[PDB]
Design a protein around this motif. Sequence first.
Motif, PDB file in Angstrom:
ATOM      1  N   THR A 162       1.238  -1.247   0.424  1.00  0.00           N
ATOM      2  CA  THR A 162       0.328  -0.302   0.276  1.00  0.00           C
ATOM      3  C   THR A 162       0.765   1.368   0.149  1.00  0.00           C
ATOM      4  O   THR A 162       1.988   1.107   0.411  1.00  0.00           O
ATOM      5  CB  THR A 162      -1.035  -0.159   1.043  1.00  0.00           C
ATOM      6  OG1 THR A 162      -0.990  -0.963   1.028  1.00  0.00           O
ATOM      7  CG2 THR A 162      -1.448   1.051   0.776  1.00  0.00           C
ATOM      8  N   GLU A 176      -0.428   7.373   3.745  1.00  0.00           N
ATOM      9  CA  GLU A 176      -1.615   8.245   3.745  1.00  0.00           C
ATOM     10  C   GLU A 176      -1.359   9.661   2.788  1.00  0.00           C
ATOM     11  O   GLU A 176      -1.637  10.308   1.719  1.00  0.00           O
ATOM     12  CB  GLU A 176      -2.103   8.519   4.955  1.00  0.00           C
ATOM     13  CG  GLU A 176      -3.570   7.530   4.773  1.00  0.00           C
ATOM     14  CD  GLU A 176      -3.347   6.055   5.133  1.00  0.00           C
ATOM     15  OE1 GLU A 176      -3.309   4.890   4.367  1.00  0.00           O
ATOM     16  OE2 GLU A 176      -2.655   5.432   5.108  1.00  0.00           O
ATOM     17  N   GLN A 215     -15.996  -4.798   5.453  1.00  0.00           N
ATOM     18  CA  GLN A 215     -16.490  -3.811   6.001  1.00  0.00           C
ATOM     19  C   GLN A 215     -17.769  -3.862   5.494  1.00  0.00           C
ATOM     20  O   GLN A 215     -18.547  -4.320   4.643  1.00  0.00           O
ATOM     21  CB  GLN A 215     -16.181  -2.487   5.557  1.00  0.00           C
ATOM     22  CG  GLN A 215     -15.699  -2.677   4.359  1.00  0.00           C
ATOM     23  CD  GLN A 215     -15.048  -1.188   3.819  1.00  0.00           C
ATOM     24  OE1 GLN A 215     -15.078   0.170   4.751  1.00  0.00           O
ATOM     25  NE2 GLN A 215     -14.786  -0.385   2.191  1.00  0.00           N
ATOM     26  N   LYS A 260     -20.294  -2.544   6.657  1.00  0.00           N
ATOM     27  CA  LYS A 260     -21.184  -1.312   6.342  1.00  0.00           C
ATOM     28  C   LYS A 260     -20.933   0.078   5.067  1.00  0.00           C
ATOM     29  O   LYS A 260     -21.759   0.489   4.933  1.00  0.00           O
ATOM     30  CB  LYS A 260     -20.369  -0.082   8.024  1.00  0.00           C
ATOM     31  CG  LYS A 260     -18.664   0.680   6.952  1.00  0.00           C
ATOM     32  CD  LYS A 260     -18.500   1.476   8.242  1.00  0.00           C
ATOM     33  CE  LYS A 260     -16.880   1.450   8.209  1.00  0.00           C
ATOM     34  NZ  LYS A 260     -17.182   2.330   6.417  1.00  0.00           N
ATOM     35  N   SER A 261     -19.722  -0.645   4.703  1.00  0.00           N
ATOM     36  CA  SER A 261     -19.848  -0.414   3.237  1.00  0.00           C
ATOM     37  C   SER A 261     -20.959  -0.746   1.769  1.00  0.00           C
ATOM     38  O   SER A 261     -21.333   0.201   1.043  1.00  0.00           O
ATOM     39  CB  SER A 261     -18.112  -1.067   2.214  1.00  0.00           C
ATOM     40  OG  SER A 261     -18.506  -1.658   1.929  1.00  0.00           O
ATOM     41  N   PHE A 307      -6.331   1.574  -2.374  1.00  0.00           N
ATOM     42  CA  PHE A 307      -6.106   2.299  -1.934  1.00  0.00           C
ATOM     43  C   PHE A 307      -7.260   2.210  -1.244  1.00  0.00           C
ATOM     44  O   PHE A 307      -7.910   1.993  -0.938  1.00  0.00           O
ATOM     45  CB  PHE A 307      -7.255   3.252  -2.539  1.00  0.00           C
ATOM     46  CG  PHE A 307      -6.911   4.983  -2.003  1.00  0.00           C
ATOM     47  CD1 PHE A 307      -6.351   5.408  -1.848  1.00  0.00           C
ATOM     48  CD2 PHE A 307      -8.307   5.043  -1.525  1.00  0.00           C
ATOM     49  CE1 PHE A 307      -6.297   7.022  -1.365  1.00  0.00           C
ATOM     50  CE2 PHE A 307      -8.795   6.241  -0.774  1.00  0.00           C
ATOM     51  CZ  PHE A 307      -8.047   7.264  -0.674  1.00  0.00           C
ATOM     52  N   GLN A 308      -6.183   2.698   0.800  1.00  0.00           N
ATOM     53  CA  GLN A 308      -6.895   3.002   1.761  1.00  0.00           C
ATOM     54  C   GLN A 308      -7.211   3.700   2.140  1.00  0.00           C
ATOM     55  O   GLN A 308      -6.157   4.862   2.274  1.00  0.00           O
ATOM     56  CB  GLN A 308      -6.204   1.739   2.676  1.00  0.00           C
ATOM     57  CG  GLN A 308      -6.514  -0.118   2.020  1.00  0.00           C
ATOM     58  CD  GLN A 308      -6.610  -0.852   1.985  1.00  0.00           C
ATOM     59  OE1 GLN A 308      -7.042  -0.914   1.086  1.00  0.00           O
ATOM     60  NE2 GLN A 308      -7.144  -1.996   2.910  1.00  0.00           N
ATOM     61  N   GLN A 350     -12.474   7.848   3.311  1.00  0.00           N
ATOM     62  CA  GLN A 350     -13.167   7.663   2.157  1.00  0.00           C
ATOM     63  C   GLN A 350     -13.560   7.078   1.979  1.00  0.00           C
ATOM     64  O   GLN A 350     -12.656   5.232   1.304  1.00  0.00           O
ATOM     65  CB  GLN A 350     -12.867   8.789   0.733  1.00  0.00           C
ATOM     66  CG  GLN A 350     -12.753   9.939   0.929  1.00  0.00           C
ATOM     67  CD  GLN A 350     -12.508  10.823   0.081  1.00  0.00           C
ATOM     68  OE1 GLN A 350     -11.717  10.602  -1.282  1.00  0.00           O
ATOM     69  NE2 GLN A 350     -12.722  12.049  -0.300  1.00  0.00           N
ATOM     70  N   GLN A 351     -14.662   5.588   2.055  1.00  0.00           N
ATOM     71  CA  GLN A 351     -15.035   4.611   1.799  1.00  0.00           C
ATOM     72  C   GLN A 351     -16.884   4.390   0.788  1.00  0.00           C
ATOM     73  O   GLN A 351     -16.834   5.682   1.772  1.00  0.00           O
ATOM     74  CB  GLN A 351     -14.990   3.239   2.938  1.00  0.00           C
ATOM     75  CG  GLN A 351     -13.997   2.606   3.011  1.00  0.00           C
ATOM     76  CD  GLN A 351     -13.403   1.883   1.798  1.00  0.00           C
ATOM     77  OE1 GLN A 351     -13.878   1.068   1.129  1.00  0.00           O
ATOM     78  NE2 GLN A 351     -12.340   2.750   0.983  1.00  0.00           N
ATOM     79  N   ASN A 352     -16.439   3.951  -0.488  1.00  0.00           N
ATOM     80  CA  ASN A 352     -17.466   4.373  -1.437  1.00  0.00           C
ATOM     81  C   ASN A 352     -18.751   2.783  -0.938  1.00  0.00           C
ATOM     82  O   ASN A 352     -18.590   1.790  -0.938  1.00  0.00           O
ATOM     83  CB  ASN A 352     -17.043   4.000  -2.926  1.00  0.00           C
ATOM     84  CG  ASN A 352     -16.852   3.017  -2.974  1.00  0.00           C
ATOM     85  OD1 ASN A 352     -16.418   2.092  -1.654  1.00  0.00           O
ATOM     86  ND2 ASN A 352     -15.809   2.837  -3.903  1.00  0.00           N
ATOM     87  N   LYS A 353     -20.342   3.821  -1.029  1.00  0.00           N
ATOM     88  CA  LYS A 353     -21.153   3.000  -0.593  1.00  0.00           C
ATOM     89  C   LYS A 353     -21.779   2.619  -1.744  1.00  0.00           C
ATOM     90  O   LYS A 353     -22.103   2.793  -2.735  1.00  0.00           O
ATOM     91  CB  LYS A 353     -22.741   3.713  -0.148  1.00  0.00           C
ATOM     92  CG  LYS A 353     -22.312   4.526   1.236  1.00  0.00           C
ATOM     93  CD  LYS A 353     -22.403   3.875   1.835  1.00  0.00           C
ATOM     94  CE  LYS A 353     -20.453   3.362   2.334  1.00  0.00           C
ATOM     95  NZ  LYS A 353     -20.694   2.710   4.102  1.00  0.00           N
ATOM     96  N   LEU A 403     -23.003   1.977  -7.509  1.00  0.00           N
ATOM     97  CA  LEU A 403     -21.532   2.132  -6.885  1.00  0.00           C
ATOM     98  C   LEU A 403     -21.356   3.917  -7.061  1.00  0.00           C
ATOM     99  O   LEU A 403     -21.418   4.353  -7.991  1.00  0.00           O
ATOM    100  CB  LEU A 403     -20.758   1.472  -7.577  1.00  0.00           C
ATOM    101  CG  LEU A 403     -19.435   1.596  -7.104  1.00  0.00           C
ATOM    102  CD1 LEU A 403     -18.887   1.780  -5.433  1.00  0.00           C
ATOM    103  CD2 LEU A 403     -18.521   0.302  -7.706  1.00  0.00           C
ATOM    104  N   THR A 404     -20.284   4.369  -5.475  1.00  0.00           N
ATOM    105  CA  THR A 404     -19.405   6.000  -6.365  1.00  0.00           C
ATOM    106  C   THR A 404     -18.725   6.118  -6.505  1.00  0.00           C
ATOM    107  O   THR A 404     -17.792   4.755  -5.915  1.00  0.00           O
ATOM    108  CB  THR A 404     -20.465   6.548  -4.674  1.00  0.00           C
ATOM    109  OG1 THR A 404     -20.278   6.341  -3.632  1.00  0.00           O
ATOM    110  CG2 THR A 404     -21.736   6.938  -4.806  1.00  0.00           C
ATOM    111  N   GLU A 427     -15.987   8.118  -5.037  1.00  0.00           N
ATOM    112  CA  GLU A 427     -15.543   8.325  -5.015  1.00  0.00           C
ATOM    113  C   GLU A 427     -13.497   9.001  -5.250  1.00  0.00           C
ATOM    114  O   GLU A 427     -13.568   9.501  -4.973  1.00  0.00           O
ATOM    115  CB  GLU A 427     -15.490   8.425  -3.716  1.00  0.00           C
ATOM    116  CG  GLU A 427     -15.114   6.931  -3.141  1.00  0.00           C
ATOM    117  CD  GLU A 427     -15.149   6.391  -1.297  1.00  0.00           C
ATOM    118  OE1 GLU A 427     -15.675   6.437  -1.057  1.00  0.00           O
ATOM    119  OE2 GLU A 427     -14.499   5.470  -0.926  1.00  0.00           O
TER     120      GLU A 427
END
Lengths: 86, 55, 83, 50, 145, 50, 125, 229, 172
Positions: free
Chosen positions: B17, B20, C1, C3-4, F26-27, F30-33, H209-210, H212
């Motif tokens: 990764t 950040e 996750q 929640k996503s 990418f972590q 922002q996490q996309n619904k 799907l968004t 982002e």
Amino acid sequence: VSKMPAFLRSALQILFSEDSTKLFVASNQGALHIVQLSGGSFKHLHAFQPQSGTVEAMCLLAVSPDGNWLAASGTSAGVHVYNVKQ
Amino acid sequence: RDHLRVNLKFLTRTRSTVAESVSQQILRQNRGRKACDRPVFTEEDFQKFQQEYFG
Amino acid sequence: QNKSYLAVRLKDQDLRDSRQQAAQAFIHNSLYGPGTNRTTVNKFLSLANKRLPVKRAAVQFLNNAWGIQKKQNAKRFKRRWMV
Amino acid sequence: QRIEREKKLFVIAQKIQTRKDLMDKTQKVKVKKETVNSPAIYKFQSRRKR
Amino acid sequence: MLVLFETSVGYAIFKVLNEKKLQEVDSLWKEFETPEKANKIVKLKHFEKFQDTAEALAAFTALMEGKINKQLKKVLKKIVKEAHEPLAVADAKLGGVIKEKLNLSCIHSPVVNELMRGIRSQMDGLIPGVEPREMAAMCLGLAHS
Amino acid sequence: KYIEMKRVAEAKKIERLKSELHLLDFQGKQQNKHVFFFDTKKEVEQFDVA
Amino acid sequence: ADVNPKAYPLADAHLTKKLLDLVQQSCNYKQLRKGANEATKTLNRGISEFIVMAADAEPLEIILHLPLLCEDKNVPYVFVRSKQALGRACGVSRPVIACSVTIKEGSQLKQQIQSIQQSIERLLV
Amino acid sequence: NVMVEPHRHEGVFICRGKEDALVTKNLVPGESVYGEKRVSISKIEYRAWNPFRSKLAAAILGGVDQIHIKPGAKVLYLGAASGTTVSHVSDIVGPDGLVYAVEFSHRSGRDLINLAKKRTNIIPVIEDARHPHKYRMLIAMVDVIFADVAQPDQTRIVALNAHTFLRNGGHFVISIKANCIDSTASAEAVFASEVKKMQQENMKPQEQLTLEPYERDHAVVVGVYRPPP
Amino acid sequence: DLQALNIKYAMDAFGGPIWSMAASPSGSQLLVGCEDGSVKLFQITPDKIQFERNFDRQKSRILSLSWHPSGTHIAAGSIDYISVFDVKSGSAVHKMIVDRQYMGVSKRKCIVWGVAFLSDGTIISVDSAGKVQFWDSATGTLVKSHLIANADVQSIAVADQEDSFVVGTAEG
């Protein structure tokens, strides 16, 4: 009651006979439905065909206290009387 | 031949990764620079002192 | 996750439009908002009582939500008064 | 590294441009002080160019 | 009822066999599910073919601004005007213009639009003469011009 | 002109590098619904991502 | 009336007053480039918020390169009816057919520029 | 030195090594469409797909379940623009497939024709997407409709095109920009309203799907049109 | 549908909530005013309605519409102004500013609740300030004002023979 047929979805007028056996329904499009009711069970007996003529007003239903006759209105043809038994 | 076991090992063990700090600097340059794009002493202490001491 | 990812049925997520809500709010503030000259129906119907040959009180004399604790003490004081 | 170089070079060009605007006879008032990220902002008196 | 269908290779005129099926628009999708059933509903009366892309460009520019050529005049008067039968059209403006220029009645309706959709879905299997290769090559030439 | 000439050139170098660096894995905050749709209620409880 | 149809984003009278007022403010803060040649250069350098053009250039084609460049950089643009009015807003004794407001860090017009940018895109529906 | 991994979507690959890139196999070897870099493995050349510029690439990297654009498929592409995303779609469908690129802008149209000259499986259509009847002669029955017009009544435009050219059981992929539909309403409120409007026509949205990381206020909806009984 | 006593169809206008709707002097066309400030023309087909054209988009929502009796011009009311449109090219020929208070200024915005248009060329407007105003379409200037109420004047109606009209106010 658990289930009902789909054609009763939009009733203009709902009327009960002097006994609980028979239920009378007028549909938004011209149609009369007679339902046999016995012990929380429903059976669709007969569907009277739309009356001929231009629709003039909202439908009105009357039932005789003996239960033999059913009168319906709402069309330019006039008030129609149906024999429930026949 | 079944490659499911082999594919799983190569698709999971190699995990890496970017930082950040690296990612957040890239994502802000993409935003742009246009206006639409871009995002112990109080007055009470002074006033009371001059009434009591010099008033 | 967990929640996503979300699973929703097609008919449930249909709710009130936010754009529609703003339209209703505009009408409310335009007709009953600050700056308008509105009175209450109780007061509006009580204007006739002030001009009658025999004066009466307000049409609805009791205010239900003016006070509840104060109402009880008045009853307590009244019972004491008859002794 | 290249992105961070772009941000600094954008600031440097504006400060030199801002200093060049100062070489004008028109009256001016400072409304902001200079910072590392932004140059000082000035408002000039309104006269048409003849 | 005759229906006019425009494709890159030329003009196609079909005849509907079962006019009763056209009344139920919701059930019409079942008729064009397979090439066996679609040929029972419609058949090809006539097909007029464009020889080259220069001629085809002259055709389709007129069609989509509500005008008909001299050659399209000849096809309509022979196939559709000698016969006495309504002509379905996909464009209301095109059907309107036909009425003045030729003594011919044109019908445009949502049932007509559903009929157009079925013919397009069974595009192969309804015109036997035109080869698939000729259709594809003609499309590229017409699109670029 | 010297600063701007350097600035515009390496700005294009930034866009070139971003064409092959796509921020895989990418972590971030922002996490996309991601939302799925089902006709029947029973599918909603029995939903499993895998 | 009698306006060339090629100047499609034609602002009305109310928006014109807002535009020319903001242009006049940008002149006081040294945030405006005047002339079609100078307006073109800001688009190439990517430092422009929006572009204002005059619809009454007798050959209109002398400014039609600007809408093409604006669509590449995604920069809003509008047309006004009078080049004399645009020239006086820019603070120049000569007519001006195109002007560009430039990007400034710490500019006090940021709220006003953003409102004008939002107003322009509404003309594009 | 490059290692190539198959992607879950057929015709799509992912390229690692010196570059972290999502790639597709080049249909015309040795040619670059818009300056994207290319890598070779041994014989086989791949082209990088930029997620910052393209929205379909962003959706694929975002974890979309289905794109439905497959080799040997007919695709109707609304809002072709210069053709950067069109070129990658032409790679996926291959020689068997066809792509119909519809673009109304004249300046973007000139870039399509140059791209269409080098790729036989692209059919350029310089027309307005609001009037599908004006180009019915050119388009046969298609399998997938992709719409990226970014214009307030996008739903009505897709439905008109879907009724004329999309087969029963076909799929659609629609990109929605929240501030274009309504600038003042919130993004999730705007997206739900479009979902309601899709249901009004015979369109069933199956996922959403968004986008982002590469964009803001964008969402992609994938669904089926006239699903089989 | 009057005969079947149900709704034939509902169609999305795609312009947000709709505030007002007016039919043309001939029944063939329909005019729609929406929240976004757009004026939309719909052609009435034998079975449904079809969207035809958009007029020039306005800065605020459109609350009332009126047709020229010959069908060549359109009047539209909105917060603090009235817009006159030409039907051939949907562009606003005139914008008419309405004073917020009768011969005065106020912080409260003026809302034009209804607009009626006469064959001679006069536009009659009613606003929240409580006055009925006459405008000239040719010059786009106010001709006469009548103050009639202390509250909003909210409704306008004109007879087919243009010798009488009626207004309704918030006071009843």
